[PDB]
Amino acid sequence: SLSNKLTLDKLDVKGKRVVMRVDFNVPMKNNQITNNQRIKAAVPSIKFCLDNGAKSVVLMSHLGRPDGVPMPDKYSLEPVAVELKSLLGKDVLFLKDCVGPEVEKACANPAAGSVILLENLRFHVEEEGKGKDASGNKVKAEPAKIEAFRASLSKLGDVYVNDAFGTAHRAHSSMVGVNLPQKAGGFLIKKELNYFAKALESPERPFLAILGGAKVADKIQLINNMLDKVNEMIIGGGMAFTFLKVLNNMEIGTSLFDEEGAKIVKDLMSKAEKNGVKITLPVDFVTADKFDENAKTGQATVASGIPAGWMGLDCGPESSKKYAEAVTRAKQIVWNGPVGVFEWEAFARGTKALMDEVVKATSRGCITIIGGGDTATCCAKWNTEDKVSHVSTGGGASLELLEGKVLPGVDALSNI
Ligand SMILES: Nc1ncnc2c1ncn2[C@@H]1O[C@H](COP(=O)(O)OP(=O)(O)O)[C@@H](O)[C@H]1O
Numbered sequence: 439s440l441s442n443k444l445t446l447d448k449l450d451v452k453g454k455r456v457v458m459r460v461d462f463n464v465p466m467k468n469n470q471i472t473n474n475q476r477i478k479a480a481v482p483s484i485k486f487c488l489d490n491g492a493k494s495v496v497l498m499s500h501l502g503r504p505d506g507v508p509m510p511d512k513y514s515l516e517p518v519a520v521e522l523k524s525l526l527g528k529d530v531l532f533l534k535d536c537v538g539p540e541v542e543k544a545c546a547n548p549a550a551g552s553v554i555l556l557e558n559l560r561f562h563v564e565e566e567g568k569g570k571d572a573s574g575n576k577v578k579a580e581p582a583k584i585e586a587f588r589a590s591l592s593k594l595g596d597v598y599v600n601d602a603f604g605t606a607h608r609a610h611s612s613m614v615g616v617n618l619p620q621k622a623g624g625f626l627i628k629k630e631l632n633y634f635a636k637a638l639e640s641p642e643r644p645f646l647a648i649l650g651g652a653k654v655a656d657k658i659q660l661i662n663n664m665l666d667k668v669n670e671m672i673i674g675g676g677m678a679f680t681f682l683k684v685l686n687n688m689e690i691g692t693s694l695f696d697e698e699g700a701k702i703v704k705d706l707m708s709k710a711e712k713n714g715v716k717i718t719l720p721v722d723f724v725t726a727d728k729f730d731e732n733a734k735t736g737q738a739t740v741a742s743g744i745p746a747g748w749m750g751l752d753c754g755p756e757s758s759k760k761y762a763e764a765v766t767r768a769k770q771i772v773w774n775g776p777v778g779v780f781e782w783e784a785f786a787r788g789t790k791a792l793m794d795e796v797v798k799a800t801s802r803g804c805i806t807i808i809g810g811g812d813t814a815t816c817c818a819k820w821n822t823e824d825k826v827s828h829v830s831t832g833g834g835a836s837l838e839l840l841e842g843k844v845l846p847g848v849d850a851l852s853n854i
């Protein structure tokens with residue numbers, strides 16, 4: 439369950455050392471930070487701890503995929519300690535490791551108010567439990583070593599806080615291996631739990647899911663689970679052409695087509711009919727002569743077909759209208775996946791227009807939840823983060839929740 443978890447607001451931190459797992463996996467260009475959003479996002483949990491009299495806050499995270507080898511020239515967290523000091527108005531001590539005797543001593547009984555940032559957890563194979571050696575071979579971590587790694591992390595605080603939703607789908611040492619009596623979700627995780635519980639357990643009605651993406655076959659469990667919960671579903675993006683080819687015999691040109699997904703389209707429509715779910719597919723398209731930002735563009739409908747050579751890379755104006763009609767009926771919306779190639783301006787109108795409708799919906803009291811990854815990227819690109827109810831901080835984690843799975847990092851949190 440998402441509803442029965444201990445959170446930071448209910449956790450007594452006064453005089454306690456707080457070991458906190460954060461998401462500082464920020465985008466980099468040669469170990470310099472291009473977007474600090476994820477660092478700003480953790481600040482409320484850190485300041486709460488400091489303001490409520492925590493003895494220390496020890497921050498642990500990963501960055502990139504070092505795959506269990508130390509790579510401090512390429513994937514060090516050191517630049518984050520500088521960024522964090524800017525954002526907190528407080529000195530941040532950066533340590534060049536995250537476990538072992540020197541780190542445990544630094545963290546044993548620090549001065550009241552101390553903020554410490556540890557080096558990349560994924561420099562140790564014991565964090566993910568497997569990785570690659572410098573020859574590129576697979577290695578798995580050894581049990582006794584995983585135990586020692588976990589025990590060393592657990593020394594660094596008296597209580598544990600997880601504010602890294604983006605890793606909560608992974609049974610990694612920092613997510614599930616910290617052995618302290620109280621394990622609480624921080625304020626980012628609290629928001630994720632609150633919104634996705636509402637969504638998956640007791641949504642407002644009508645509940646609309648907006649699903650986009652390239653393939654059908656890798657989204658079958660997502661679609662199937664959402665068909666158990668929703669009243670309406672928009673299917674957009676590249677995956678729509680598989681549905682349209684199968685159901686209408688549409689000529690789709692060089693548009694994405696999922697041969698294995700094609701074999702289950704009617705099975706999905708069948709379940710939608712059985713559950714009384716209204717499916718809204720697109721009816722018109724912006725076409726491209728190739729998969730390129732500066733492609734020549736055209737227009738098509740289902741009735742016209744797409745010319746051979748050409749591909750549908752966005753929905754068209756009548757599709758936007760049908761999509762807006764479903765948004766207008768909704769009292770709750772989950773949106774996972776853009777409805778066209780939003781990275782390229784010529785193919786971004788459908789996604790921007792739908793975002794405008796979703797913002798207007800929120801204004802009139804719709805609960806609007808944006809999945810992590812590409813849909814969240816659109817909100818940042820068009821500055822709509824504060825104009826929807828919730829923008830999830832974890833792509834892979836939000837997708838696994840929406841598929842109906844239990845997240846090992848959430849499960850590891852204390853109950854009540
Ligand atoms: N009509 C389309 N044709 C091809 N690609 C598309 C289309 N609509 C959206 N996309 C692209 O699909 C990509 C993501 O699809 P997918 O990889 O299944 O989802 P995710 O990124 O969430 O894993 C995005 O980069 C987006 O630009």
Ligand SMILES: [Mg+2]
Nearest residue numbers: 650651652775
């Ligand atoms: Mg997608």
Ligand SMILES: [Mg+2]
Nearest residue numbers: 651652653656
């Ligand atoms: Mg895909």
